[PDB]
Amino acid sequence: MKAAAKRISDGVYWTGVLDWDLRNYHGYTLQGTTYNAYLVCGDEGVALIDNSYPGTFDELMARVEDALQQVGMERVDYIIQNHVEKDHSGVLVELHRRFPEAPIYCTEVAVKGLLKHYPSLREAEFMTVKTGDVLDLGGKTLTFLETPLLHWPDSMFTLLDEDGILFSNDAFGQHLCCPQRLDREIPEYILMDAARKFYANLITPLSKLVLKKFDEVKELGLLERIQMIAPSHGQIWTDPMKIIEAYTGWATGMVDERVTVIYDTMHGSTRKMAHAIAEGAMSEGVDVRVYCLHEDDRSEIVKDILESGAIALGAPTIYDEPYPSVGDLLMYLRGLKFNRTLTRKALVFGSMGGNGGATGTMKELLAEAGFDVACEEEVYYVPTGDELDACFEAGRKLAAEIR
Amino acid sequence: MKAAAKRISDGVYWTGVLDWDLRNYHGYTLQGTTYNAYLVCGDEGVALIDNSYPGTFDELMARVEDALQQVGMERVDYIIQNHVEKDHSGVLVELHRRFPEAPIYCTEVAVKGLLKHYPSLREAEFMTVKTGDVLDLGGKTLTFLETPLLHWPDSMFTLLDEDGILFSNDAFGQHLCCPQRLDREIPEYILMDAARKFYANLITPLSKLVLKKFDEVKELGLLERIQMIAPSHGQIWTDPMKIIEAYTGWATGMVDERVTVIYDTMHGSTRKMAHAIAEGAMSEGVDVRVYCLHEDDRSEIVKDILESGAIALGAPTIYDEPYPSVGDLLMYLRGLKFNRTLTRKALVFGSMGGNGGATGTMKELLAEAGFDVACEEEVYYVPTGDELDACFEAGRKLAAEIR
Ligand SMILES: Cc1cc2nc3c(=O)[nH]c(=O)nc-3n(C[C@H](O)[C@H](O)[C@H](O)COP(=O)(O)O)c2cc1C
Ligand SMILES: Cc1cc2nc3c(=O)[nH]c(=O)nc-3n(C[C@H](O)[C@H](O)[C@H](O)COP(=O)(O)O)c2cc1C
Ligand SMILES: [Fe+3]
Ligand SMILES: [Fe+3]
Ligand SMILES: [Fe+3]
Ligand SMILES: [Fe+3]
């Protein structure tokens, strides 16, 4: 099969795979992604940093063969596993069948992970590594740095001292499938928005660890030496500081003035309420997004919550409880824990036909999710003009509060 | 406009609307529904029991005009509203305008709900009814029976006793849109399964109030006459004891031997677990259903739950929580309160890669939802052969418990 490797420095090649067709990656929507694997070529040997999703071996392999072609090398000598997740380890056993001599390099925890996933790796040689440990390839040294919970217990970064490339696994990744491999080669909106989404859905609960890990990279004195950041998804950062600055901002809760309005509805009244709240917030010169849970994915919603100082979540009440779709978002938000960056303000609202109770349940679940809920707007059936005025007011107050 | 009315008894005609297009009625999936209005004509006056969704007046009005020409009467003399909900009250403004003399007949609570929906009816003549009240039509008499929380606070039945016909509104309804009007005129599998899904999604939490309502009609000496049930959705029950006996089974929790397996997954490990649980259930000769939350609607899932003695719920853990899709089903289950029919047995399972926590949360939330849930199957990453043997055993044991 014909697929070319892409040279990113002297002796360092991208040799991953392009997944044009992926549209839904475990409850995360996208327009394709890539699985980035990299081949590092020293004097004495070559290392393969990560691999790809199962079934994609032929493509990965064509690319490494092409890169072994150009450097005049014979084989992969070392297989590095930054991370155990399926999309980066999925062809590890094909790799081990193709290069029988090559040890697998990973953290002590990852070896349990890897043996659980693919038991046929029972008599593979595993070299355990921890922070500080080095792999010398000849004029090229690989330094390992353990990153537990960023984003899994098993994970680590590999650093290549001479080229200043940080191989970061999921960290700094973005889900985008372009023919261009570098950050500077595509629209920056598209780049930064995919990066933002990745952060909102995957890094948000890790935010404090993100910050501390920045310090520990600084304390070891490794930030000066970082000239390129090569994650396992999406674009390679030829401007590492662009994304580090963005991650720092997201982790410390920066945000411009913005209210995210989220709702569901059966008969429209809560929709009417949602609209008036949006108008109110709009009156204060604040940015305003409106989401409907019947239509909109939670990964797209959460991407805006990240850049929002406040939200308004509304739903009608059915048999004492909120409309169930709201239960999906709130469970997700209880995992993501936005309070770890910023305790965002929240308005809770809805229409109801009797005793109600949707606003009560949403309050509790918003609190446990780390939102500060002040006031609610509860309407009996279709809101009158004056009731829609009160939603306008609530919308405006919420916005003024975060100005 | 040409739309003909249907004689269902002497002086009694269906005059509803056929909604072929509806596919989604507030999170309830269907292949069309109907809005049944009934024209009831005595020797002195004519009553119109209920109406239809907003914007569908010309269709309803066409049918009521056919029924009028057919039966030889001039216009509608009384407007009857059993339910305030807009699929049955959506053209009441256009009926009050078309018949500016015809009083609106509803309960006390309905009036507040109907004025809030349509502020225009402020200067309309309301004729407030309660249980035992009669509207004499000249030879035919209507008897009004209140049914609060059955389905709504403002709900009521209208009866015809010298004729034994129950106008039950949402009760005994089914979301079907068929050219045929009667229960007997369409396959009973289709009929009953419709009626099943309608009970499961709409009547379940009302179960105990359905048995007491049967006790009350029997105490007032009215049900041992029953010839026909005429609901506001779907087929007219010419065999009313079939749906009344089914409703009795559903409210007391009768069920055949059946387990329902429900799960979500990201990488397929929880899926391998669900399939093994199902195999185990199957080894006991019990009926089995298997739903994935990524694909399947909550109204379909719940329909099978109604006919199941036991369920299994599985999900991988994601940031210390179960897969978010679970939160939607659990919040919906929490409102349906299946424990008012039968405390069903439950099995909680799922794969994880660290500390877990999903199955602890599901065990907790399912018990809140009225299920009796002992035992979780928790697997680290990909389940081994023995771990799937263990899942098989869990499903078998769940299955044997309900035999
Ligand atoms: C399935 C069904 C059950 C309901 N149960 C309740 C309830 O328990 N308590 C309540 O206050 N309203 C209940 N409602 C009434 C609605 O909450 C009310 O009509 C509300 O205004 C709907 O707002 P929406 O237009 O945004 O859908 C129920 C409505 C339906 C459709
Ligand atoms: C987004 C992400 C976050 C995760 N967070 C946790 C965690 O909180 N705790 C844990 O035990 N596992 C966590 N997991 C690991 C999954 O539970 C594990 O990979 C599991 O095998 C998935 O099961 P499945 O194959 O059925 O999707 C996480 C996985 C992903 C991809
Ligand atoms: Fe990952
Ligand atoms: Fe990844
Ligand atoms: Fe209704
Ligand atoms: Fe209805």
GROMACS .gro file of N, CA, C and O in nm, chain B residues 79-169:
model
  364
  482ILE      N    1  -6.936   2.236   2.415
  482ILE     CA    2  -6.797   2.200   2.397
  482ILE      C    3  -6.746   2.135   2.525
  482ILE      O    4  -6.756   2.193   2.633
  483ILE      N    5  -6.693   2.013   2.513
  483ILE     CA    6  -6.643   1.938   2.629
  483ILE      C    7  -6.492   1.917   2.623
  483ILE      O    8  -6.440   1.866   2.523
  484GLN      N    9  -6.423   1.959   2.729
  484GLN     CA   10  -6.277   1.944   2.740
  484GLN      C   11  -6.240   1.855   2.858
  484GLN      O   12  -6.245   1.898   2.974
  485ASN      N   13  -6.203   1.731   2.827
  485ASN     CA   14  -6.165   1.635   2.930
  485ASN      C   15  -6.024   1.661   2.981
  485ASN      O   16  -5.992   1.629   3.096
  486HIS      N   17  -5.942   1.722   2.895
  486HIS     CA   18  -5.798   1.739   2.917
  486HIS      C   19  -5.757   1.875   2.860
  486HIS      O   20  -5.794   1.909   2.747
  487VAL      N   21  -5.679   1.952   2.935
  487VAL     CA   22  -5.633   2.082   2.887
  487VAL      C   23  -5.516   2.078   2.788
  487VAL      O   24  -5.491   2.177   2.718
  488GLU      N   25  -5.444   1.965   2.781
  488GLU     CA   26  -5.325   1.952   2.696
  488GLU      C   27  -5.350   1.988   2.549
  488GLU      O   28  -5.451   1.950   2.492
  489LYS      N   29  -5.254   2.059   2.489
  489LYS     CA   30  -5.275   2.126   2.360
  489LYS      C   31  -5.299   2.035   2.238
  489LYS      O   32  -5.342   2.083   2.134
  490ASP      N   33  -5.271   1.905   2.251
  490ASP     CA   34  -5.309   1.813   2.144
  490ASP      C   35  -5.460   1.782   2.145
  490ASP      O   36  -5.513   1.722   2.052
  491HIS      N   37  -5.529   1.827   2.250
  491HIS     CA   38  -5.673   1.807   2.262
  491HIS      C   39  -5.751   1.936   2.277
  491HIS      O   40  -5.872   1.934   2.273
  492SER      N   41  -5.680   2.047   2.293
  492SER     CA   42  -5.742   2.177   2.317
  492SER      C   43  -5.693   2.285   2.220
  492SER      O   44  -5.734   2.402   2.230
  493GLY      N   45  -5.606   2.245   2.127
  493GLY     CA   46  -5.540   2.336   2.034
  493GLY      C   47  -5.628   2.416   1.939
  493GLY      O   48  -5.584   2.519   1.887
  494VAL      N   49  -5.751   2.369   1.915
  494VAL     CA   50  -5.846   2.446   1.831
  494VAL      C   51  -5.973   2.494   1.904
  494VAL      O   52  -6.075   2.525   1.841
  495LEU      N   53  -5.967   2.503   2.037
  495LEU     CA   54  -6.081   2.545   2.118
  495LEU      C   55  -6.120   2.692   2.095
  495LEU      O   56  -6.238   2.727   2.101
  496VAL      N   57  -6.020   2.776   2.070
  496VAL     CA   58  -6.041   2.918   2.035
  496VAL      C   59  -6.122   2.930   1.905
  496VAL      O   60  -6.218   3.006   1.897
  497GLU      N   61  -6.084   2.850   1.805
  497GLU     CA   62  -6.154   2.844   1.676
  497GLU      C   63  -6.293   2.779   1.685
  497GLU      O   64  -6.379   2.807   1.602
  498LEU      N   65  -6.314   2.694   1.785
  498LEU     CA   66  -6.446   2.636   1.813
  498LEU      C   67  -6.536   2.733   1.888
  498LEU      O   68  -6.655   2.742   1.859
  499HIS      N   69  -6.480   2.805   1.985
  499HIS     CA   70  -6.553   2.909   2.056
  499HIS      C   71  -6.593   3.024   1.963
  499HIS      O   72  -6.697   3.087   1.983
  500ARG      N   73  -6.510   3.051   1.861
  500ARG     CA   74  -6.540   3.155   1.761
  500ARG      C   75  -6.643   3.106   1.657
  500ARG      O   76  -6.731   3.182   1.617
  501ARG      N   77  -6.630   2.980   1.614
  501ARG     CA   78  -6.726   2.918   1.523
  501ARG      C   79  -6.862   2.894   1.590
  501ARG      O   80  -6.966   2.903   1.525
  502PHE      N   81  -6.860   2.865   1.720
  502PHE     CA   82  -6.984   2.847   1.797
  502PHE      C   83  -6.988   2.939   1.919
  502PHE      O   84  -6.969   2.893   2.033
  503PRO      N   85  -7.016   3.070   1.898
  503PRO     CA   86  -7.006   3.170   2.005
  503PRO      C   87  -7.111   3.155   2.115
  503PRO      O   88  -7.105   3.227   2.216
  504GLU      N   89  -7.206   3.064   2.096
  504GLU     CA   90  -7.307   3.035   2.197
  504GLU      C   91  -7.273   2.911   2.281
  504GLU      O   92  -7.314   2.902   2.397
  505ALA      N   93  -7.197   2.818   2.224
  505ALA     CA   94  -7.169   2.689   2.288
  505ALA      C   95  -7.078   2.694   2.412
  505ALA      O   96  -6.957   2.717   2.399
  506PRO      N   97  -7.136   2.671   2.533
  506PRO     CA   98  -7.060   2.668   2.659
  506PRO      C   99  -6.950   2.562   2.660
  506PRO      O  100  -6.965   2.456   2.599
  507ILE      N  101  -6.839   2.592   2.728
  507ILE     CA  102  -6.729   2.499   2.747
  507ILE      C  103  -6.748   2.422   2.878
  507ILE      O  104  -6.760   2.483   2.985
  508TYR      N  105  -6.750   2.289   2.868
  508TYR     CA  106  -6.775   2.199   2.981
  508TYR      C  107  -6.648   2.126   3.023
  508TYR      O  108  -6.599   2.038   2.950
  509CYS      N  109  -6.598   2.159   3.141
  509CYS     CA  110  -6.474   2.101   3.191
  509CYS      C  111  -6.477   2.103   3.343
  509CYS      O  112  -6.574   2.150   3.402
  510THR      N  113  -6.370   2.054   3.406
  510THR     CA  114  -6.362   2.054   3.552
  510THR      C  115  -6.328   2.193   3.606
  510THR      O  116  -6.307   2.287   3.528
  511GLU      N  117  -6.321   2.206   3.738
  511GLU     CA  118  -6.280   2.331   3.802
  511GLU      C  119  -6.135   2.366   3.771
  511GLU      O  120  -6.104   2.480   3.736
  512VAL      N  121  -6.046   2.267   3.785
  512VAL     CA  122  -5.902   2.287   3.763
  512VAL      C  123  -5.868   2.316   3.616
  512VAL      O  124  -5.787   2.404   3.587
  513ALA      N  125  -5.932   2.243   3.525
  513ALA     CA  126  -5.920   2.269   3.381
  513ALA      C  127  -5.938   2.416   3.339
  513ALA      O  128  -5.864   2.464   3.254
  514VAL      N  129  -6.036   2.485   3.399
  514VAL     CA  130  -6.063   2.627   3.369
  514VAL      C  131  -5.940   2.717   3.388
  514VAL      O  132  -5.910   2.800   3.301
  515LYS      N  133  -5.871   2.701   3.500
  515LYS     CA  134  -5.744   2.772   3.524
  515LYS      C  135  -5.636   2.737   3.421
  515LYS      O  136  -5.564   2.825   3.373
  516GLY      N  137  -5.626   2.610   3.387
  516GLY     CA  138  -5.528   2.565   3.287
  516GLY      C  139  -5.562   2.612   3.146
  516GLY      O  140  -5.473   2.644   3.068
  517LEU      N  141  -5.692   2.617   3.115
  517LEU     CA  142  -5.740   2.653   2.982
  517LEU      C  143  -5.733   2.803   2.958
  517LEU      O  144  -5.709   2.848   2.847
  518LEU      N  145  -5.753   2.881   3.064
  518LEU     CA  146  -5.739   3.027   3.056
  518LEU      C  147  -5.593   3.071   3.040
  518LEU      O  148  -5.565   3.171   2.974
  519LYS      N  149  -5.502   2.994   3.101
  519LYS     CA  150  -5.357   3.020   3.094
  519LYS      C  151  -5.299   2.989   2.956
  519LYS      O  152  -5.206   3.057   2.910
  520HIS      N  153  -5.354   2.887   2.890
  520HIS     CA  154  -5.316   2.851   2.753
  520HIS      C  155  -5.371   2.950   2.652
  520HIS      O  156  -5.299   2.992   2.560
  521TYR      N  157  -5.498   2.986   2.668
  521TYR     CA  158  -5.568   3.071   2.572
  521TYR      C  159  -5.638   3.184   2.648
  521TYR      O  160  -5.753   3.169   2.690
  522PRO      N  161  -5.567   3.297   2.667
  522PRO     CA  162  -5.614   3.417   2.738
  522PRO      C  163  -5.737   3.480   2.673
  522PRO      O  164  -5.810   3.557   2.737
  523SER      N  165  -5.758   3.447   2.545
  523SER     CA  166  -5.872   3.493   2.465
  523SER      C  167  -6.006   3.447   2.522
  523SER      O  168  -6.106   3.518   2.511
  524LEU      N  169  -6.007   3.329   2.583
  524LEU     CA  170  -6.128   3.269   2.640
  524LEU      C  171  -6.169   3.331   2.774
  524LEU      O  172  -6.252   3.273   2.846
  525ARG      N  173  -6.112   3.447   2.808
  525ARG     CA  174  -6.151   3.520   2.929
  525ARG      C  175  -6.300   3.554   2.929
  525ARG      O  176  -6.365   3.544   3.033
  526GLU      N  177  -6.353   3.591   2.812
  526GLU     CA  178  -6.494   3.631   2.799
  526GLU      C  179  -6.581   3.518   2.742
  526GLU      O  180  -6.687   3.543   2.685
  527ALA      N  181  -6.534   3.394   2.759
  527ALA     CA  182  -6.609   3.275   2.719
  527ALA      C  183  -6.692   3.217   2.834
  527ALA      O  184  -6.658   3.235   2.952
  528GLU      N  185  -6.800   3.148   2.800
  528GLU     CA  186  -6.889   3.093   2.901
  528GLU      C  187  -6.842   2.954   2.940
  528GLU      O  188  -6.844   2.861   2.859
  529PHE      N  189  -6.799   2.940   3.065
  529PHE     CA  190  -6.754   2.811   3.118
  529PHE      C  191  -6.863   2.747   3.202
  529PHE      O  192  -6.930   2.816   3.282
  530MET      N  193  -6.882   2.616   3.185
  530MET     CA  194  -6.980   2.543   3.264
  530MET      C  195  -6.913   2.432   3.343
  530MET      O  196  -6.901   2.319   3.297
  531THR      N  197  -6.870   2.468   3.465
  531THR     CA  198  -6.788   2.382   3.553
  531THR      C  199  -6.857   2.254   3.602
  531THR      O  200  -6.964   2.259   3.664
  532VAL      N  201  -6.793   2.139   3.574
  532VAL     CA  202  -6.848   2.008   3.609
  532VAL      C  203  -6.767   1.935   3.716
  532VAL      O  204  -6.648   1.961   3.734
  533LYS      N  205  -6.833   1.843   3.787
  533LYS     CA  206  -6.768   1.753   3.882
  533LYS      C  207  -6.826   1.611   3.872
  533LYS      O  208  -6.928   1.590   3.806
  534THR      N  209  -6.761   1.515   3.938
  534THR     CA  210  -6.802   1.374   3.936
  534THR      C  211  -6.949   1.356   3.973
  534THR      O  212  -6.991   1.396   4.082
  535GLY      N  213  -7.024   1.296   3.881
  535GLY     CA  214  -7.165   1.268   3.901
  535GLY      C  215  -7.255   1.364   3.825
  535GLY      O  216  -7.376   1.339   3.813
  536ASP      N  217  -7.199   1.474   3.775
  536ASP     CA  218  -7.275   1.572   3.697
  536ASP      C  219  -7.314   1.519   3.559
  536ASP      O  220  -7.240   1.441   3.497
  537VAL      N  221  -7.430   1.566   3.512
  537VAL     CA  222  -7.495   1.518   3.390
  537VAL      C  223  -7.521   1.633   3.292
  537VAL      O  224  -7.561   1.742   3.333
  538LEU      N  225  -7.495   1.610   3.164
  538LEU     CA  226  -7.539   1.700   3.056
  538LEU      C  227  -7.645   1.630   2.969
  538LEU      O  228  -7.613   1.546   2.885
  539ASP      N  229  -7.771   1.666   2.993
  539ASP     CA  230  -7.885   1.606   2.924
  539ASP      C  231  -7.893   1.657   2.779
  539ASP      O  232  -7.899   1.779   2.756
  540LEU      N  233  -7.893   1.565   2.683
  540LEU     CA  234  -7.894   1.600   2.540
  540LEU      C  235  -8.028   1.571   2.471
  540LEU      O  236  -8.041   1.592   2.350
  541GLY      N  237  -8.125   1.523   2.549
  541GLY     CA  238  -8.254   1.478   2.497
  541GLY      C  239  -8.248   1.332   2.453
  541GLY      O  240  -8.225   1.303   2.336
  542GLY      N  241  -8.269   1.241   2.548
  542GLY     CA  242  -8.260   1.097   2.522
  542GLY      C  243  -8.122   1.039   2.552
  542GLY      O  244  -8.109   0.930   2.608
  543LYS      N  245  -8.019   1.112   2.512
  543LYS     CA  246  -7.882   1.078   2.549
  543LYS      C  247  -7.836   1.166   2.663
  543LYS      O  248  -7.856   1.288   2.661
  544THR      N  249  -7.775   1.105   2.764
  544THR     CA  250  -7.718   1.181   2.875
  544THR      C  251  -7.569   1.149   2.895
  544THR      O  252  -7.528   1.033   2.897
  545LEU      N  253  -7.490   1.255   2.908
  545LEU     CA  254  -7.349   1.245   2.943
  545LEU      C  255  -7.332   1.253   3.095
  545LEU      O  256  -7.397   1.335   3.161
  546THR      N  257  -7.245   1.167   3.149
  546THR     CA  258  -7.206   1.170   3.290
  546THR      C  259  -7.057   1.199   3.297
  546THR      O  260  -6.975   1.131   3.233
  547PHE      N  261  -7.022   1.300   3.376
  547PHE     CA  262  -6.884   1.341   3.393
  547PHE      C  263  -6.823   1.277   3.517
  547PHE      O  264  -6.883   1.277   3.624
  548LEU      N  265  -6.704   1.220   3.499
  548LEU     CA  266  -6.629   1.160   3.609
  548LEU      C  267  -6.490   1.222   3.614
  548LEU      O  268  -6.417   1.218   3.515
  549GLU      N  269  -6.454   1.279   3.728
  549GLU     CA  270  -6.321   1.338   3.745
  549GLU      C  271  -6.213   1.232   3.757
  549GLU      O  272  -6.230   1.133   3.828
  550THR      N  273  -6.101   1.252   3.688
  550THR     CA  274  -5.984   1.165   3.704
  550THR      C  275  -5.853   1.245   3.722
  550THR      O  276  -5.767   1.244   3.634
  551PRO      N  277  -5.838   1.316   3.836
  551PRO     CA  278  -5.713   1.390   3.857
  551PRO      C  279  -5.591   1.299   3.867
  551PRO      O  280  -5.601   1.187   3.921
  552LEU      N  281  -5.478   1.346   3.815
  552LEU     CA  282  -5.351   1.272   3.814
  552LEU      C  283  -5.364   1.141   3.735
  552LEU      O  284  -5.305   1.039   3.771
  553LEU      N  285  -5.441   1.148   3.627
  553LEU     CA  286  -5.495   1.029   3.562
  553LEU      C  287  -5.554   1.065   3.423
  553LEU      O  288  -5.668   1.027   3.394
  554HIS      N  289  -5.479   1.132   3.334
  554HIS     CA  290  -5.334   1.153   3.339
  554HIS      C  291  -5.287   1.288   3.401
  554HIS      O  292  -5.182   1.293   3.466
  555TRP      N  293  -5.365   1.395   3.383
  555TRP     CA  294  -5.332   1.528   3.440
  555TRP      C  295  -5.427   1.570   3.553
  555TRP      O  296  -5.534   1.512   3.568
  556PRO      N  297  -5.387   1.670   3.634
  556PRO     CA  298  -5.470   1.731   3.742
  556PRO      C  299  -5.611   1.781   3.700
  556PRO      O  300  -5.700   1.792   3.785
  557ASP      N  301  -5.628   1.810   3.572
  557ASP     CA  302  -5.748   1.872   3.517
  557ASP      C  303  -5.831   1.772   3.438
  557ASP      O  304  -5.929   1.810   3.373
  558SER      N  305  -5.792   1.645   3.444
  558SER     CA  306  -5.850   1.542   3.359
  558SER      C  307  -5.982   1.487   3.410
  558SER      O  308  -6.010   1.488   3.530
  559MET      N  309  -6.064   1.439   3.316
  559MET     CA  310  -6.195   1.379   3.347
  559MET      C  311  -6.244   1.287   3.234
  559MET      O  312  -6.205   1.303   3.119
  560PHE      N  313  -6.330   1.190   3.270
  560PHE     CA  314  -6.398   1.102   3.173
  560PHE      C  315  -6.539   1.155   3.145
  560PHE      O  316  -6.599   1.218   3.231
  561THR      N  317  -6.589   1.128   3.025
  561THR     CA  318  -6.728   1.151   2.991
  561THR      C  319  -6.783   1.013   2.957
  561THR      O  320  -6.715   0.933   2.892
  562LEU      N  321  -6.904   0.985   3.005
  562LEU     CA  322  -6.970   0.856   2.988
  562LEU      C  323  -7.101   0.869   2.912
  562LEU      O  324  -7.161   0.976   2.906
  563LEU      N  325  -7.146   0.758   2.855
  563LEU     CA  326  -7.278   0.748   2.795
  563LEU      C  327  -7.332   0.615   2.845
  563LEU      O  328  -7.281   0.510   2.806
  564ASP      N  329  -7.432   0.619   2.933
  564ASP     CA  330  -7.475   0.500   3.006
  564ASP      C  331  -7.584   0.413   2.940
  564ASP      O  332  -7.572   0.290   2.941
  565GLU      N  333  -7.688   0.474   2.884
  565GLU     CA  334  -7.785   0.399   2.804
  565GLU      C  335  -7.718   0.341   2.677
  565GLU      O  336  -7.782   0.273   2.596
  566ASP      N  337  -7.588   0.367   2.663
  566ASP     CA  338  -7.511   0.326   2.546
  566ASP      C  339  -7.379   0.257   2.586
  566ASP      O  340  -7.314   0.194   2.503
  567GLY      N  341  -7.341   0.270   2.713
  567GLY     CA  342  -7.220   0.206   2.767
  567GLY      C  343  -7.089   0.241   2.699
  567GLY      O  344  -7.003   0.155   2.682
  568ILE      N  345  -7.073   0.368   2.659
  568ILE     CA  346  -6.951   0.416   2.592
  568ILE      C  347  -6.871   0.511   2.681
  568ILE      O  348  -6.922   0.613   2.725
  569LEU      N  349  -6.745   0.477   2.706
  569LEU     CA  350  -6.655   0.560   2.787
  569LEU      C  351  -6.563   0.644   2.701
  569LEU      O  352  -6.480   0.591   2.627
  570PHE      N  353  -6.577   0.776   2.711
  570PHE     CA  354  -6.481   0.868   2.650
  570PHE      C  355  -6.372   0.894   2.753
  570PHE      O  356  -6.391   0.972   2.847
  571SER      N  357  -6.259   0.825   2.736
  571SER     CA  358  -6.156   0.815   2.840
  571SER      C  359  -6.037   0.911   2.827
  571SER      O  360  -5.944   0.904   2.908
  572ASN      N  361  -6.041   1.001   2.728
  572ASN     CA  362  -5.925   1.086   2.694
  572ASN      C  363  -5.794   1.002   2.681
  572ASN      O  364  -5.798   0.895   2.623
   0.00000   0.00000   0.00000
